[PDB]
Every structure is written in structure tokens, then in C-alpha cells.
Design a protein around this ligand. Structure first.
Ligand SMILES: Nc1nc2c(Cl)cccc2s1
Ligand code: NI
Ligand code: NI
Length: 328
């Protein structure tokens, strides 16, 4: 089912104003929402306003939406409200450096998609649900969770006075849902591998063209992935801390696989922490680097995200060689 924010919750956010000093920081790729928990909702409003305009959605309908989107996230270590807003910010940063490539309808859809992309997450992966045949795996055969995430989004839209997209033409309403659906589905990392490879080939052969709708969906696809993984693009100490959350969640799933007579993969096994560095190294070379490498080629203003990822790759190599500092 679906939860609704209180009258007290959405009204408090409307009064919200972003401290002056933050306006300058929020624009940067490396900005870290972490030290500002109370502000997160109003941080998103700010990004929506700056990107899509103040007269984009009715403020009340938007604020009701956001605080209900907050409440429908779970107290899991990683795939939580904190993550949703961190992905939204990275998208906002990309959009601001690439504003005129994307239409007004796309930007609003992509920002909403990022905030909604992990809705009602349980801390269990696609592997888990399909290995053990959860009812979600039978209803959604591929990209299982990502389909539930979008289904959750639509359910929140259908709440009393929550529909932010109502003041669009019925044709544009169809379009923005499809943009959102295609964005949320693209966060399934299984799909990423094929997407990047294809996008790379289209760029090298020069056939890439943003006026071709199928190309746009793919670039949007890579952008979604870039935002999903942006923890690997923050400053090393922030990157290190977030990893602890990702693994805290991985390990609790491993704790379930054991009882049902399965040795879970090394990455999810809490008695196998020693492999974590080399696992990150592998994940950067196989997924992260190539994702930010390709995105930069397509959108050169996004280059700082790749610089920061190369930076964190280097720090994981340092941890492997035993050169690790304290960092808490
Ligand atoms: N830093 C991050 N690491 C991972 C791994 Cl190892 C698997 C899947 C997603 C992510 S995000
Ligand atoms: Ni997800
Ligand atoms: Ni995510």
C-alpha cells in the first residue's frame, strides 16, 4: 500500500527557504546533501524551481507529492530518502550544465523520476527476489524492482491533490509518464551494460544524434545511471562513508540467503569484508569509469563527474596496497 504525508508535513515545507550560502554550492557536481538532513525536501523544491520554474507545478500539489514521496521510502541502510535526493541533485547538476539540450517536459520528468526511482525499496536485490520467487518476480519478470518503483510513483500521483502533472495536456501527460518510466527502468544496472556499449558505438561512428528519439532515451538512460552511482563522484571521505551504507544493506540480504541454504555471493557476505576493496576496484573498472567516460564524451560539461570517479578509483587502489588513512 501507499502512505500519505500529514497536513503538518507538507505545510512546513512550503514555508521553507534555502540559506543563501547553499545556493552557490548546490550548483556544483560534488555537492554533498549529507550535512543538511532537515533541508532535503526544500532542497528539492529549490532545484525544481530553478530548473523548471516556480509556475511549473502548483506549490501545494508539489509539496504534498514530495513529502509523500519521502514517507514511502524505507529505513533501509542505503536505498533510502537520502539516496533519492542525492540522485535528484546529480540530475539537477547535469541538467543545469546541459539545460537547452532537454525540453521543459523532460527536465521536470527526470527530476521527479530521480526522486522516485527507488520508491518502496526493501533492501533486497533483483537477484534475491528472482532466486527465491517473491510474488514481485512473477508479476515483474525483468527489471523487477525498477518496475515496482514506477508503479509506486504512479500510485502517489493518483493520491488526492498529489497529481503535479495534471496541468499538462493529456498528450504531454502521456509523454512525461513515459519519460519517467523509461528513466526509472534504466536504473536497472543489467540494462546499463548494453546501453553504454551501444552509446559508445554510436558516438565513435558519429551516428549519434539527439534529434533521434531512440538516441535521446539512451542518453537519458546513461544520465540516470550516472546519477544513481554518483556516490562514487563525491569527495573521498563522503564516498567511503556511503560505501558503508551500500554494504550494510548487501550484508543483511546475505544474512537471509544463508538460512535458506545458500552461500551468498562474496559481495553480500558479512564474513568476507576483506574482499570489499578489490570488489570496488572491479566495480569502478567494469561499470563506473566507463559510465562517466561515455557520458563526458556525450556531454562534455559533465567532465567533473569523471575526474572525481578517477580520483576515488585511485583511493581504492591505495586501500588495496595498504596505504589507508583513518577517515572514520
Ligand atoms: N559504489 C557502489 N558499488 C556498487 C556495487 Cl559493488 C554493486 C552495485 C551498485 C553499486 S554502487
Ligand atoms: Ni533502484
Ligand atoms: Ni538508486
Amino acid at each position: 500500500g501507499t502512505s500519505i504525508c500529514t497536513s503538518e508535513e507538507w505545510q512546513g515545507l512550503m514555508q521553507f527557504t534555502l540559506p543563501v550560502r547553499l545556493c552557490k554550492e548546490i550548483e556544483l557536481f560534488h555537492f554533498d546533501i549529507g550535512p543538511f538532513e532537515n533541508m532535503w525536501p526544500g532542497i528539492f523544491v529549490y532545484m525544481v524551481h530553478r530548473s523548471c520554474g516556480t509556475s511549473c507545478f502548483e506549490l501545494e500539489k508539489l509539496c504534498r507529492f514530495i513529502m509523500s514521496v519521502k514517507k514511502n521510502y524505507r529505513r533501509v541502510p542505503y536505498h533510502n530518502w537520502k539516496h533519492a535526493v542525492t540522485v535528484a541533485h546529480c540530475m539537477y547538476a547535469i541538467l543545469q550544465n546541459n539545460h537547452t539540450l532537454f525540453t521543459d517536459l523532460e527536465r521536470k520528468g527526470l527530476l521527479i523520476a530521480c526522486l522516485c526511482h527507488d520508491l518502496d525499496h526493501r533492501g533486497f536485490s533483483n537477484s534475491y527476489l528472482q532466486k527465491f520467487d517473491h510474488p514481485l518476480a512473477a508479476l515483474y519478470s525483468t527489471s523487477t524492482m525498477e518496475q515496482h518503483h514506477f508503479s509506486q510513483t504512479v500510485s502517489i500521483l493518483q493520491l488526492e491533490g498529489h497529481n503535479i502533472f495534471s496541468t499538462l495536456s493529456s498528450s504531454e501527460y502521456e509523454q512525461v509518464l513515459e519519460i519517467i518510466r523509461k528513466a526509472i527502468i534504466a536504473t536497472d544496472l543489467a540494462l546499463y551494460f548494453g546501453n553504454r556499449k551501444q552509446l559508445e558505438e554510436m558516438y565513435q561512428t558519429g551516428s549519434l544524434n539527439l534529434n533521434n528519439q531512440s538516441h535521446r532515451d539512451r542518453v537519458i538512460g546513461l544520465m540516470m545511471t550516472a546519477c544513481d552511482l554518483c556516490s562514487v563522484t563525491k569527495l573521498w571521505p563522503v564516498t567511503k562513508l556511503t560505501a558503508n551504507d551500500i554494504y550494510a544493506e548487501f550484508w543483511a540480504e546475505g544474512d537471509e540467503m544463508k538460512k535458506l541454504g545458500i552461500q551468498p555471493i562474496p559481495m553480500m557476505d558479512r564474513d568476507k569484508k576483506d574482499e570489499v576493496p578489490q570488489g570496488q576496484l572491479g566495480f569502478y573498472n567494469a561499470v563506473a569509469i566507463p559510465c562517466y567516460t561515455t557520458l563526458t564524451q556525450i556531454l562534455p560539461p559533465t567532465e567533473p563527474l569523471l575526474k572525481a570517479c578517477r580520483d576515488n578509483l585511485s583511493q581504492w587502489e591505495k586501500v588495496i596496497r595498504g596505504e589507508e588513512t583513518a577517515t572514520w
